[PDB]
Amino acid sequence: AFDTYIKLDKVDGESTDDKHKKWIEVLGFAWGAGNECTMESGTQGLNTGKAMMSVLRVTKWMDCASVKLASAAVQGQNFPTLELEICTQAGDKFAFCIYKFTHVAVSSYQCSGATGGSDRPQETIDFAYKEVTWEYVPQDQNGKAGGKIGPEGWSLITNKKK
Amino acid sequence: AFDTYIKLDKVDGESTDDKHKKWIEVLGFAWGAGNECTMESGTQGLNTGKAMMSVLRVTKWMDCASVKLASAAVQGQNFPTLELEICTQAGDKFAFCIYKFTHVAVSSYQCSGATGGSDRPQETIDFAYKEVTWEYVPQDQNGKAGGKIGPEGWSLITNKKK
Amino acid sequence: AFDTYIKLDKVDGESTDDKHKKWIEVLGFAWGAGNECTMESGTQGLNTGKAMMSVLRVTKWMDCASVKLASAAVQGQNFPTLELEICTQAGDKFAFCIYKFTHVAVSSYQCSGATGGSDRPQETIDFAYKEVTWEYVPQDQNGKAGGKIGPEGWSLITNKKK
Amino acid sequence: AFDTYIKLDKVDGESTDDKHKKWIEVLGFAWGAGNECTMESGTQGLNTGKAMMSVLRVTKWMDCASVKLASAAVQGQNFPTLELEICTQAGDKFAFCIYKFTHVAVSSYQCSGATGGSDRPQETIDFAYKEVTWEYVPQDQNGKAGGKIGPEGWSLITNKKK
Amino acid sequence: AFDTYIKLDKVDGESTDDKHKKWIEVLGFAWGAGNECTMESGTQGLNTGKAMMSVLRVTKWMDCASVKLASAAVQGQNFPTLELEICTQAGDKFAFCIYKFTHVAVSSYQCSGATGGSDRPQETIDFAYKEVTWEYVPQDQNGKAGGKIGPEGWSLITNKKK
Amino acid sequence: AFDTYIKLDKVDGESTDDKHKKWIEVLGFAWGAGNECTMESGTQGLNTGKAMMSVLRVTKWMDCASVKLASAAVQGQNFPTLELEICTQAGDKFAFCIYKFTHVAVSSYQCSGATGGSDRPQETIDFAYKEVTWEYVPQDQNGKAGGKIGPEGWSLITNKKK
């Protein structure tokens, strides 16, 4: 259920499934946005102010991407595009949620090792970006998919939509 | 027990039950209000000062509303009306508590994915607003409902009741 | 054991037991007082300074009082009298502790809903006040009650006892 | 094991055991002292500076002392003497630790009620003081007691020993 | 699984396995790097700013290295090289991750003892450094290893790569 | 396993084992040292700066030493020597780690009592000092001991080694 993959330009991960070959296998993502809307209690309009977005926080094991992720950090390396993709365990293994970032960087890379229990050390990566898109897809109780829900998004270079 | 649904103007969720078609299915809500009454210990009257209210914090899975919720955030999108509704599992599936917000915005949208366990990622949404109403309904031990308890509320535009 | 009820002037709760009809059924109360006695280590006398008291923090389910409690908050509504009462499960269901507040307000009302597990949402209410009284009653191991322990208390309008 | 009792001048608690009639039965005490000795790393001598002591934090159920404890708080009531006593479950139910405070006050009284589970609400009391004494007594593996370990202590009025 | 060893110049640990004789056996490592990339939302470029790296936090039992580690701390002792190495439990016990630090110091040494349960006290060591290298190696599902992933790294003396 | 004893000059504890008669039996110790080595990222050398050490935090039950420990606190009492010693459960009950402090004080004494469960109240003592030594001893898998690992240490009066 909710198997998550993520793609970086010229950065081979280790995945194996048909639709995500050499992608990076990821556990959790965590991501957020929201504006500066106060509870005011004195102003007539709402007053949304400015828009804002959060880094994406990826969790995953060590793989073949580690070293590049490690270097990316201290290198301030610019990527054109990061694609996040969560795909259904059942149904048709399709992506019911397709995220898309543009102008991405690794803002932090962390590493740590349980020691003697769970296999594979675990890393946590923070991906800073400029632009992004949501895209969601429902699933027919009959197993199959349904219509895709209008790909929308936002840009921190323009402070406009999509 | 305590099944919670929530409605937004022109924002189809995914619900299915008769009374809440295409509504957004929600787990928890959390909401609060209260004034600035100090323990003083020097003033003769009570001294309630100003009134205040909190954002509503919704919890729910990803659905078809996600993308719109996502966009709403960075878009500062204004909605006329948000209706919250908690409905009894037994009895007559009626709403024993009907909340009503007027002039609503999404102040924050957060996203996160367990990775490989529970199904469906989970989002947490903060809804800023201008006005609102409580409304509660008791339930007859004989299963059925009882009289509705006077719909009351408050406005941050007037700082008056109802 | 330790069943707690609480009464507000013209504010029907939902209780049912003989001695507390239409009272508000409550789970926890939490309450505190104490003065500003420092560990000094330089002054000869003790130096109690000023007296102080805390809000009472009530916990309970949603009931018929909710809406009034909700309104009370933003309304800064003044009540003459709040009576707290904890009554023995065994023995004679009598109140072994009788609290009494005078000039009460709701300083905050909070709401929240588990989602799908425990029944009934849960609210937490903070009651600000001016005056109050303890009153305790022992219980005879023979089941029955014993003498009542001198009703005492204090006032924040006078900073005197009882 | 480690049954704790505590005595206040003209303040009947509820205890029953032979050696502690009408004393107040207590669960935990928590107490501390220590000076202002820094890790310096620049000064030749140690440099203990000033001496200091902590309030005693008592935990216990509601009893017949509650009301007096409650009043003591807001009243800044001065007591001459508080005796703490921890007594062995086995052996001879003797006190292997005898604490003694002089010039005591209640600096805070807190109250709280679980609601519906454990019996008896629980209060936490902070006792401010001027002077105090330790006294400890070993126990013969043969069940019986041993010699008492020199009653020592300290005073915050003199900043001298015993 | 994920057995971790670490080597210091002229500092015999206690390990025993063929490939890591007299090395120091370690449980967890924890390590991190990342730059100062803000979510900006006003600047056109990304703006990675400066690069930065974290201390390495080692966890291990007391061994023969303890005393030297202890002395290193207060001595500010400079080492040329610290090699970290995590080796597969299965396959060929090879190191699928080879870390390499240059110009290392012990910035802190901590000690602590459970008391009576787990064997061996536990120490936590922080290793400050100047330079370092990642190096990772995949593993053939057929048990054996695969190609090594380009040894990269970074230097805080140059603020350049590798 | 890892049985810990500690000795103070003219301060009889309660221990019983042959090698530690009347010593104080202790559960945990916790102790630390380390210098002020920054991650700099601008300076060429390492830059260890100053050396520093932590108090030793002892945990133990109440015994015959309590009262003296209690008095030591408020008395700022100077001891010449504190010896810490952790001894193997198996093998030959020898001390595989011998700590030695010189010019010791009790900087804090804390007390607390579970109430009715675990036997014996528990105290936590902080020992401030001037000087100290590590000393470790390996153990032959054949049960017996091995060579002792050079007794080293440090002084806060000189800021030199051993």
Numbering used by the authors:
A (entry chain A), B (entry chain A), C (entry chain A), D (entry chain A), E (entry chain A), F (entry chain A): 2 to 163
What does the paper behind this entry write?
The structure of recombinant EvpC from E. tarda was solved by molecular replacement using a dataset collected on an R-axis rotating anode generator and refined to a 2.8 Å resolution. The EvpC model consists of residues from Ala2 to Lys163. There are two molecules in the asymmetric unit. Each monomer of EvpC consists mainly of a β-barrel domain, with extended loops lying predominantly on one side of the β-barrel. A head-to-head stacked hexameric ring structure of EvpC can be observed in the crystal lattice. This stacked ring structure forms a tube with an outer diameter of 80 Å and an inner diameter of 40 Å. The analysis of crystal structure confirms that all these residues (D4, E15, E26, K161, K162 and K163) are exposed on the outer rim of the EvpC hexameric ring which makes them available for interaction with other proteins.
The type VI secretion system (T6SS) is a recently discovered protein transport complex which contributes to bacterial pathogenesis. Secreted proteins of E. tarda T6SS include a Hcp homolog EvpC, a VgrG homolog EvpI, and a novel protein EvpP which is not commonly present in other T6SS clusters. Our previous functional studies showed that the major secreted protein EvpC is a key member in the EVP system of E. tarda and the secretion of EvpC is a critical step for the function of T6SS. The overall structural and sequence similarity between EvpC and Hcp1 strongly suggest that EvpC is a member of the Hcp family of proteins.
